[PDB]
Amino acid sequence: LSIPSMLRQCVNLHPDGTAFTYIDYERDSEGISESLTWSQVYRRTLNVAAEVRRHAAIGDRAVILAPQGLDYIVAFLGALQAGLIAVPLSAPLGGASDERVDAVVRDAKPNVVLTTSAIMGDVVPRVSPPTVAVDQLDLDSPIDDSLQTTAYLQYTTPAGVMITYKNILANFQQMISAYFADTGAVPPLDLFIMSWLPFYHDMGLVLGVCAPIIVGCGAVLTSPVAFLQRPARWLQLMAREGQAFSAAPNFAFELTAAKAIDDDLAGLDLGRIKTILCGSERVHPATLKRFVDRFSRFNLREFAIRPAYGLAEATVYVATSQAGQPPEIRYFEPHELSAGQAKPCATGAGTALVSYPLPQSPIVRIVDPNTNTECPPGTIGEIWVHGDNVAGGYWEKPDETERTFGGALVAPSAGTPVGPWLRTGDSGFVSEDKFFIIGRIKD
């Protein structure tokens, strides 16, 4: 039913199984691991929940301003355990990033701020609500109020996407069914999650923090700076024992192919990697090819690479490639694409695009954004999305909610709901029964 309840079940079933392992490379370029079992992380979460209840009531917002690490995870889970609506943000980094933080805090109006003692002095100016240094609590002392609906707000004029447990669970059902379709929607026994994505991004939170609990497997986590410093670390950590499930944007596939150092890869066997999602940015076929052409020499399988389309307003996932096959690439004439039409062209020529199966859940339609009517196959329009993973709106923003989540189709085709539809702002088309993403409709 909810993340707190599923964490409790993880403890009941496998209290001594390793849940989260965080690798810090600041003090040793080989990495220092710190791990928690399910029982350890649950205890820490209960201790955070007890603290936050002293400051905030059920349904209040709890902003999280903490560096990447285990304290972030227990702050987020502890907020949920106490029935608070968590608001995951980044540590204060300066510049625009700090004015984003200030604007989110004024929008979400939190009654508690969860942080760490190391950055406490940087956090206090950014927030009167009590500020709790999570690492200074007695997190491992021996020791519910959760909601069943709204879990957290995902910001990314600040508009906080309201994400419910129903949204999360529906999106995980959709993801597990699509990613693992070739094994009957059953993940392998030795799956593990590996992520360096920041927890204040949708994919980093959903994969790094939520998925271990919902799927019931351990996670191996590090920070984005550790990856950027030495990109081979991503491959080293995915090559740990078991079948890794990871994710990154297109730029990081390119950077790893271009900058991972061969000697850091010596002896790695990438042939057990289950899935590497490529998502949150337009997926470039040329980048996927450079990545697989290099890392197939270490046994990476091309069917492990899964382009993934989505957005925070849909929790995270909308569509992905067919399980058990490498990405399908199709080619289209560029002059016609600029004119709004998809015209196939010879393999390799024109514009290469990833071809996605139309998802069975959620559903996708290509819609003319000025007439609210579905486009014929081949005509470019806005991608509209419908399904139980689609959020119910932006926090305390009725008007922006109507504009973004209130799409309504004129004369919908058979089997297509009138609405409400999430208007993604993304442009795309359907061609030969496959789905394609081009860009943004504003363009």
Author numbering: 4 to 130, 138 to 153, 159 to 171, 177 to 463
Copied sentences from the primary study:
Additional catalytic steps are acylation at the 6- and 6′-positions of SL1278 with two multiple methyl-branched (hydroxy) phthioceranoic acids, most likely through membrane-associated Chp1 to produce fully elaborated SL-1. These multiple methyl-branched (hydroxy) phthioceranoic acids are synthesized by polyketide synthase 2 (Pks2) using an activated fatty acid starter unit provided by fatty acyl AMP ligase FadD23. FadD23 is one of the 34 fatty acid adenylating enzymes (FadDs) in M. tuberculosis. FAALs use a carboxylate substrate and ATP to form acyl-AMP. The full-length M. tb FadD23, containing a large N-terminal domain (1–460) and a small C-terminal domain (473–584), connect by flexible loops and an anti-parallel β-sheet (465–472), was obtained.
Next, we solved the 1.5 Å crystal structure of M. tb FadD23 N-terminal domain. The N-terminal structure was compared with that of the complex with ATP or AMP-PNP, and the RMSDs were observed to be 0.4265 and 0.3836 Å, respectively. No obvious changes in substrate binding sites were observed. At the same time, after analyzing the structure, no extra differential density was observed, indicating that the N-terminus of FadD23 could not capture fatty acids from the same expression system. We inferred that the C-terminal domain serves as a cover for fatty acid binding to FadD23 and is important for the function of FadD23. The protein of the M. tb FadD23 N-terminal domain has no fatty AMP-ligase activity. Based on our results, we believe that the FadD23 N-terminal domain alone cannot efficiently bind fatty acids without C-terminal domain and the C-terminal domain plays a crucial role in the catalytic mechanism.
